Design a binder for this molecule. Sequence first.
Ligand SMILES: CCCCCCCCCCCCCCCCCC(=O)OC[C@H](COP(=O)(O)OCCN)OC(=O)CCCCCCCCCCCCCCCCC
Ligand SMILES: CCCCCCCCCCCC(=O)OC[C@H](COP(=O)(O)OCC[N+](C)(C)C)OC(=O)CCCCCCCCCCC
Ligand SMILES: CCCCCCCCCCCC(=O)OC[C@H](COP(=O)(O)OCC[N+](C)(C)C)OC(=O)CCCCCCCCCCC
Ligand SMILES: CCCCCCCCCCCC(=O)OC[C@H](COP(=O)(O)OCC[N+](C)(C)C)OC(=O)CCCCCCCCCCC
Ligand SMILES: CCCCCCCCCCCC(=O)OC[C@H](COP(=O)(O)OCC[N+](C)(C)C)OC(=O)CCCCCCCCCCC
Lengths: 75, 69, 158, 132, 77, 205, 61, 90, 491
Amino acid sequence: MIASLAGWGLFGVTVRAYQQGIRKVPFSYYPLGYVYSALGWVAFGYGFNLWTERNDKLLEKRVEKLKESRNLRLS
Amino acid sequence: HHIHTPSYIKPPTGGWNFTPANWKQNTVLVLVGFTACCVGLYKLGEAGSYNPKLKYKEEELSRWNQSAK
Amino acid sequence: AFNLQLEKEIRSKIDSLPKLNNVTNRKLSLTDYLFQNAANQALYVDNEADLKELDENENEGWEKIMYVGFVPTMILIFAIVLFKDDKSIDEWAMDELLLRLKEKNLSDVELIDELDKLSKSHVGKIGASEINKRDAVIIERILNGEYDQLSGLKKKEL
Amino acid sequence: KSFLPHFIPKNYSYGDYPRLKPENLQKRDPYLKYDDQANKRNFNEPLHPQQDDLDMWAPDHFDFVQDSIALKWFGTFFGVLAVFSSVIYIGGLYPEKPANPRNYPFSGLAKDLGASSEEDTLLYAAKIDKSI
Amino acid sequence: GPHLLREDASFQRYGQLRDNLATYWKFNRKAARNVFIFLVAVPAGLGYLAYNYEGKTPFVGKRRTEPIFEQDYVPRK
Amino acid sequence: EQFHLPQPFWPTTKTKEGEYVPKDSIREASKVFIGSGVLLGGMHFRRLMQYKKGSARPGLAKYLNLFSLSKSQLIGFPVALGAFSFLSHSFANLQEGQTATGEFAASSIASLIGLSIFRTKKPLSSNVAIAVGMGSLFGFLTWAGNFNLGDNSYRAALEAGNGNEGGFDNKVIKTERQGFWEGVYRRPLSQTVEDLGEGRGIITQ
Amino acid sequence: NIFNKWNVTPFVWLFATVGIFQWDKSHRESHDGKGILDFLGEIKVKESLDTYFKEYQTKVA
Amino acid sequence: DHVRSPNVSFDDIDYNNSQDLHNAQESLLREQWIRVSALKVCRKALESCYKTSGPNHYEDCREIAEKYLNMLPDHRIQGFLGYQKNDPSK
Amino acid sequence: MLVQNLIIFNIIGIVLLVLLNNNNNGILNKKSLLTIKNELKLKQIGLIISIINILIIIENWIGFNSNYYGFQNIERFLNIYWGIDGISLLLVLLTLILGPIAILSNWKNLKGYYTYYVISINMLVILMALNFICLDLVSFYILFESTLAPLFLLIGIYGANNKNKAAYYVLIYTLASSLFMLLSIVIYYIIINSTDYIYINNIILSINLQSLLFIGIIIGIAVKTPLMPVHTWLPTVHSESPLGGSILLAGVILKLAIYGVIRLLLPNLSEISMMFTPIIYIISILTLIYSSLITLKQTDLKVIIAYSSISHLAVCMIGIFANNLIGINGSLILCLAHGFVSPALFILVGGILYDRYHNRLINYYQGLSTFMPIFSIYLVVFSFCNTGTPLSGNFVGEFLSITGAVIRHPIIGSLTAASVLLSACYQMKLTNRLTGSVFSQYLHITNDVTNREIFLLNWLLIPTIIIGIYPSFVTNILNLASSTLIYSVLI
Ligand SMILES: CCCCCCCCCCCCCCCCCC(=O)OC[C@H](COP(=O)(O)OCCN)OC(=O)CCCCCCCCCCCCCCCCC
Ligand SMILES: CCCCCCCCCCCC(=O)OC[C@H](COP(=O)(O)OCC[N+](C)(C)C)OC(=O)CCCCCCCCCCC
Ligand SMILES: CCCCCCCCCCCC(=O)OC[C@H](COP(=O)(O)OCC[N+](C)(C)C)OC(=O)CCCCCCCCCCC
Ligand SMILES: CCCCCCCCCCCC(=O)OC[C@H](COP(=O)(O)OCC[N+](C)(C)C)OC(=O)CCCCCCCCCCC
Ligand SMILES: CCCCCCCCCCCC(=O)OC[C@H](COP(=O)(O)OCC[N+](C)(C)C)OC(=O)CCCCCCCCCCC
C-alpha cells in the first residue's frame, strides 16, 4: 500500500509546487509547505483507498444478486 | 569581364566561370575517383549479370508445362 | 566556471565607452545556472547584452544535440530496417511452402536432394537469377499440386 | 486589333478596391523603361482583381486573328482531309489486294499460336492454307 | 528585421483582396449556377457512374473467348 | 437491379398494410387555425388594454413592444400554422404515415406562405431562404424521431429481449434479419448479398 | 578544398554502411544467419505474446 | 525457428473463446499468403519459359500461362473478416 | 513499458522546464541566467526530450515481430489497454521523428516565450503518438481531441496577423465534427458495453445501424483529413499557425484521419464500408480535382502548400478504402512520404522565405536561383517529390494508391490518375516562378540557406528517398497488419 500512498503524497507535492507558481514565489520558499502538503494528501489518499476497497466489496455482493436477476431474464 | 558577385554565391556547380586555382590537383583526384569505381561497376556487373535464356534447359521446361497441365 | 573576477574586467571595459551601438575566454557550466547568487547572475547578463550589442548563423546551440542524439538515432533506425532478424508474412509463407513440399514428397529422391542443397539465403531467389542453383524439380513439384490448406478451413459451402 | 483574353469581366465590385480597365500586361511596349522591366510594371501600379490572368506568368495570349477565325480555319483544314477520305471510301477508289492474303500450314499455325485442341483452332489460328 | 522586402502598396491591396473575396460574394443567379454545377451536377454524374458499374467489371485475368482475325477474304469488286 | 445505398434511418414502428386509419386534415387544421387566431387576436386586445392603462411608464411600454404583433403577423401566424397542420396531415395520409420528407415539405411551404404575408417588404429569395431553413429543421426533427424514440429506443428494446443482454454466439445463425439494436457474431451470406450485392469481392471478383 | 566537410560526408556514410553491410554477412556465416544486431535482443514469439493477449481479452469481457 | 500455421477454422470454434477466434483469424490469413507464394512461383516458371522458348512460347508455355490466368483472380489476400462474419450455407 | 515510460518521462520533462523557468517570477526583476540567448538552455532541454522520445519507441521496436498477427506490447496504464501493431508502429515513429524538427524549425524565429512553445510541441507530439497505441474507441477520442487545447493556444499566441481567425477555425471545425464521432462511440458503448478494438471488431450490427454509425464517424474523419466540402479550415490555419504548428499539422494531425479509418471503420463496420465506398471515392476524387484547380489561383505561398496537402490526402483516402492490399499499403506509404515532404515544403515556403522577407505574397518572389542557389536546389528537389516523381516515396504511395483504386473500381478509380497531371500543374507553376526570370526587384540580397535550415531539409529528404527506392522497409512491417482489414467472401 506504500506505493499508492507514495503517489498521493507526490500529488500533494505537486499541489504545493503549483501553488508557489500562483503566488509567484521561488519553489524553494518555505520548504515545510511541501511536507505539510504531502501529508495532507496522504491522509486523503489513505481515506480514498479505504473508500475504494469498500466499494469493490459492496460491488461484488450486488453483482451476485444482479447475475441471479439476469439469469431469470435470459429464459 | 562582368561582375559575377562571387564573394558569397558559391553553388556546387561553380557560379559564372569558376575555375579554382588548384584545379589541376583536384582534377587528378576526381579522375582517380571516377576511374577507381568505374572498375567497381565493371567488377560488380560481371559477377551479377546472367543470361536469362540459358538458366533453364528446354527439357526442364517441358516437364513444367506437363506438370502444370 | 563563472569566474566573477573575469566579469568585472568585462563589465568595466564596456563602461569605458559611454556611447552604445555607435571574450572568447568565457564559458559557463551546468551547475552555474542554478547555484550562483542573484547578484552575480544579473552581472553576467548585463555583460552579455552589452557584449552582444558591440557586435554568421553558427554556434546556435543545437548542433551538438542533433549530431550526438538525433543522427545516431536515425542511424539506429537505418540499422534496424537493414540488419534486424525479422521475418515478414510474405517471407514466412515462402519458407512454409517449401517445408510442406518436403513433407508431401518424403519418398521423392530428386526433390529432397534439391531442397537440402537449396540454401536458406536463396529461398527468396527461386527462379532465374545470377545464383546457379537447381530448383527445376522444386518448381516442377509446385506446378503439379496445391500445397495450401485454405480448402480445409472453409467447411461450409453454398 | 488587340483584344483581351476570355473570362475577363467587364465590371467588378469588391468594396472600395479600385476599379480599373483590365490591361493585359503581356502587350505592353517592351522598349519603355520600367521599375520591373521583366514584368513591364512600375512600382505601385494598381493590380486588376485577376491580374494573374493578365501578366507575364499567365499563358501567352495569341491575337493575330480572332478565336472564331482561328477555329474556323482549324475546322476548314481538317474538313478537307475528311472530305478527301470520304470521297475515296464511298467511291471505293482504293486498290484491291493483288494477291490472296498470306496463309499458313498446320491449320494456320494454330498450335504455334497457343491453341490447345481442336475446339480452339479458329480462336488462335492465322489464315489457313487450304492447299495443304 | 532590416525590411529586406520592398513593400508595394498595390501588391498589399491586391493580396489583401484575394484573401478576402468571401466578404463580397453574393449568392446571385451567377453564383447559384456555379454552385449547382460543381456541388450537384458533377457529383451526380460521378454518382451514377460509380453505382452503375459497382461490381460489374470483373477485369482480373479476363480471358479472350472470340477470334480477332478474319479467316477468309472477300474482294470488293 | 436497384442501387445498394446506405440507409441511415432510426428505427420506427411500421404499420401493417390495411392499418393507419387516416386523420381528417381539414378538421385538424381547423382547430389549430381557429384556436391560434382566437388566442393571438385575444392576446392582442388584452395588451391594448395594458397600453391604455399605462403609457407614461417606460418599463411597461418596453415589455409590451417586445410582445406586440403587427397586423400582418396577427393574420399570417394563424394561416401559417393552419397550413402547416393541414399539409402535415395531408402528406401523412398520402404516405400511410409521417416521414421526414413530408414534414420538410409541409414546414417549408407553411413557412413560405406565412413569410409572404408578414414579411412582404423583403426580397422573395430571402423568404425562400428562411423557408428552406425552417423546413429543414422540422424534417430533422422528424428524422430524429420527434422528441424521443419511445418504443424504438435501446432501453425499450433491452426490456423486450431485442437487445444484447444474453451476449452472442456464432453457432446460432438466423434467417430473419437481426433487430436494429442487436449484434451478432456471424450472419447468413445471403443477407450480405442482399445488402451489398455481388461484385467487387462478394462471391465473385 | 575538395575534401571539405560537406563533400566527404556522403562518402563516409556510404563506405561505413557498406562496411557494416559486409560485416553483417560474415556474422550470418558464423551465427546460423543471426544478424549483427542480435546482441540488442531477439523478437518475441507468438506463445509469449498470446498469453498477454489472452489476459487482455479476458479483462475486457 | 520457423513457426507454423495453427490450422483452425471458424466453423469448429466458439467465438466467445478469445484465443480460439484469434487462431482461426490467423489460420485463414496464413493460408492466403501461401497461395500468394505459390502464384509467384508459377509466374516465375512462366517468365523463364517465355525467355527460353522465344517464338515457341505460345506452345511451350501454354499450360503454365493457362494456370496463372486461372489462379490470379483468387490467389490474393482476401482477409478473414469476410468468412468470419458470413455463413455461406445459410 | 512503452506508454508508461513515454508518459512518465515527459511529465518529468514538463515539470522540469516549468520549475527552472518560473522560479524567478516573484518581483525579483532579476536578469536570471537561463533567459540568455533566447532561453538557450531551456530550448536545449526540450530538444533533448524530443530525441529521447524517439529512443523509447526504438527499444520496443527491437522486439517487434512482423510475423505475428495481433497487437503486441499489450500494456495496461491508467485503466487503459495500450498495444501496437505494424500500422501503429510506423505512425508512432513518424510522429516522434517530427518532434525535434518542429522545435528546431522555430529555434530562433519566435518573439519570445520559448519554454511555453517547446512544452506545447512536446505535449502535442506525445498526445498524437499515444493516439496510435490506444486500444479502445473512447481512448481514441480522448487523444483525438486532447490536442485541441494546446494547438488552440499555440496558434493564438505564436501565430501570424490573422491568428485569431485561425485559432477559432481549428477549435470549432474539429471539435464540432468530432462530437459527431463521439455520438457513434457512445452508441457502441451502449449496445455492446465496451469500446475495445477486438471486442467491437467481431460484432455485426444491423445494416441500418451501421449506416448511422458510419456517418457519425465519417463526419469527424472527413473534417480532419480534410475532405471537400469541410476543408475550409485548413488553408486558414496553415497560413497563420507558427512553423512548428504547420509541421505537426501537416505531418501528423492529418494522418490521424487515415488511422481513424483503419481502426474505427474497416474492422467493425465492414459491411457498411463497402456500401459507402462509391460515395467515398466520389467525394475524394472531387476533393483531389477541385483542390488542384483551386491551388492554381492562390496568391499566398503557405496557402498554396496547404491546398497541395489536401490533394494528396484525398489520394490517401481513396487508397485506404480500396479493399485490397495494394491500395491499403499504398495509402500508408503515401501517408509517411507526405509526412516528410509536406513539412519540408512549409520550411522552404514559410520558414526560410518568411523568416527573411516576412511576406507570403507570390508577386514578390522570382528568380531566386540567382542569389539563393542552395534554396533553389531543395525547392526544386522537393517539388518533384511533391508531384510523385519516381525515386520518391510519394510516387510509390501514389502509384499503389491509384492502382488499388483501379482494382477496386476500374471505371471511377481511373480518375485518380489525374493526381499525376494536376499535382504537377500547380506545384511546378509555383516552382517555375520562384526559380524563373531575373531576381525580384522587390527583394534585397540576403543570406542563403543556413546550416540549421540545411539540416532540416536534408533529414526530411533522406527518408523520402530511402522509402522511394526500397519501400520494403515499410511494406514488410505493414504486410501482416494490413491484410486483416480486407473484407471479401469469394465463392
Ligand atoms: C365558449 C368558448 C370558450 C373558449 C375557451 C377557450 C378560450 C379561448 C382560447 C382559444 C382556444 C385555445 C385553447 C383551447 C383549449 C386548450 C387546447 C386543448 O386542450 O385542445 C382543445 C382544442 C381541440 O382539441 P381536441 O382534440 O378536441 O381536445 C382533445 C380531445 N380528446 O385544441 C386546439 O386545437 C386549440 C388550438 C391550439 C392551437 C393554437 C395554439 C398554438 C399557437 C398559439 C400559441 C400561444 C402562445 C404559445 C404559448 C406557449 C409559450 C411557451
Ligand atoms: C506543475 C505540475 C503540472 C502537472 C504535473 C502532473 C503530476 C501528476 C502527479 C500524480 C501523482 C501520482 O502518481 O499519483 C498516483 C496516486 C496513487 O495511485 P493509486 O492509489 O495506486 O491508484 C491507482 C491509479 N490507477 C487507477 C491509474 C492505477 O494517486 C493519486 O494521487 C491520484 C491523483 C489525484 C487526481 C485527482 C482525482 C482523485 C481525487 C478524487 C476527488 C473527486
Ligand atoms: C494529517 C494530515 C495533514 C497534516 C497537516 C495539515 C495541517 C497543516 C497546517 C500546518 C501549519 C501551516 O499551514 O502553516 C502555514 C504554512 C506556511 O504558509 P505560507 O504560505 O508559506 O506563509 C508564509 C509563512 N512564513 C511567513 C512564516 C514563511 O502553510 C502551509 O504550509 C500550507 C500547506 C497547507 C496544507 C493543506 C493540506 C490540505 C489537504 C486537503 C485534502 C482534501
Ligand atoms: C502530458 C500531460 C501534461 C499536462 C500538464 C500541462 C502543463 C501544466 C503547466 C502548468 C505550469 C505553468 O503554467 O507554467 C507555465 C509554462 C511555461 O511558461 P513560461 O514560458 O515559463 O512562462 C513565462 C515565464 N517567464 C516570463 C519568466 C519566461 O507553460 C506551460 O507549461 C504550458 C503548457 C500548457 C499549455 C496548454 C494548456 C492546455 C490545457 C488543457 C490540457 C488538456
Ligand atoms: C537523377 C538525379 C540527379 C542528381 C544529380 C544531378 C546533378 C545535381 C546538380 C546540383 C547543382 C545545381 O545544378 O544546382 C546549383 C546550380 C547553380 O547554378 P550554376 O550553374 O552554378 O550558376 C550559378 C549562377 N546562378 C546563381 C544564377 C544560378 O543550379 C541552380 O541553383 C539553378 C536553379 C535550379 C536548381 C537545379 C536543381 C536540380 C536538381 C535535380 C532534381 C531531380
